[PDB]
């Protein structure tokens, strides 16, 4: 879904993201803040940004009106491919032209992106040392991340809520690199005694 869906942002960050990284016609979808778990289409038109609410009924998606769809992606495809079907109060047409990609949280090499728990356990045991760590995306809680650490291998969920990064609680961090740097210096302790030392990175190989 990364080509157009941004799970950890807000209307405000979607605005900024569309106005900096985007062009007129650029759009993204995101969770709703005014009614979870609806979704929201944020769209850039003629230098400004408009937010459109998507209803989540459990059996379909729609725009509180109009056609209904099995998936969010089908709804988005529909309004990309049928022009004039999306009109403001003034009757101005809203055009969904260019999906804005969800960028990776960092460009450091210990970030592996899409990667499973098991793939992380393999790479780390058969190519890392004790205290070898990486960060990856969470498949159990999409939108979140995971710190994968050689010690056996331990996985720690990294929550991303409102652009903040924490390790389940404790200090919220600005960027994913702040959280990693901070926990190298000051090791975290799992609640079974084990200290998760981040000793050396296991970088991606390409």
């Amino acid at each position: 879904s990364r080509r157009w869906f941004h799970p950890n942002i807000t209307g405000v960050e979607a605005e900024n993201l569309l106005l900096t990284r985007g062009v007129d016609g650029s759009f993204l979808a995101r969770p709703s803040k005014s009614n979870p778990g609806d979704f929201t289409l944020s769209v850039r038109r003629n230098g400004a940004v408009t937010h459109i609410k998507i209803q989540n009924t459990g059996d379909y998606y729609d725009l509180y009106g109009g056609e209904k769809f099995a998936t969010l992606a089908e709804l988005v495809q529909y309004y990309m491919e049928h022009h004039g079907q999306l009109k403001e109060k003034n009757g101005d047409v809203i055009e969904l032209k260019y999906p804005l990609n969800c960028a990776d949280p960092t460009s450091e090499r210990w970030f592996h992106g899409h990667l499973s728990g098991k793939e992380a356990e393999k790479l780390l045991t058969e190519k890392g040392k004790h205290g070898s760590f990486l960060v990856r995306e969470s498949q159990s809680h999409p939108g979140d991340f995971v710190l994968s650490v050689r010690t056996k291998v331990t996985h720690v969920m990294i929550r991303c809520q409102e652009l903040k990064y924490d390790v389940g609680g404790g200090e919220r961090f600005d960027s994913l690199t702040d959280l990693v740097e901070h926990y190298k210096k000051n090791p975290m302790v799992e609640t079974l005694g084990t200290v998760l030392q981040l000793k050396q990175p296991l970088n991606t190989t390409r």
């Binding site: 995971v146 720690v156 389940g168 609680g169 799992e190 609640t191 079974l192």
Partner: peptide
């Protein structure tokens, strides 16, 4: 199983 962290 993923691990928890308190403080």
């Amino acid at each position: 199983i993923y691990a928890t962290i308190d403080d």
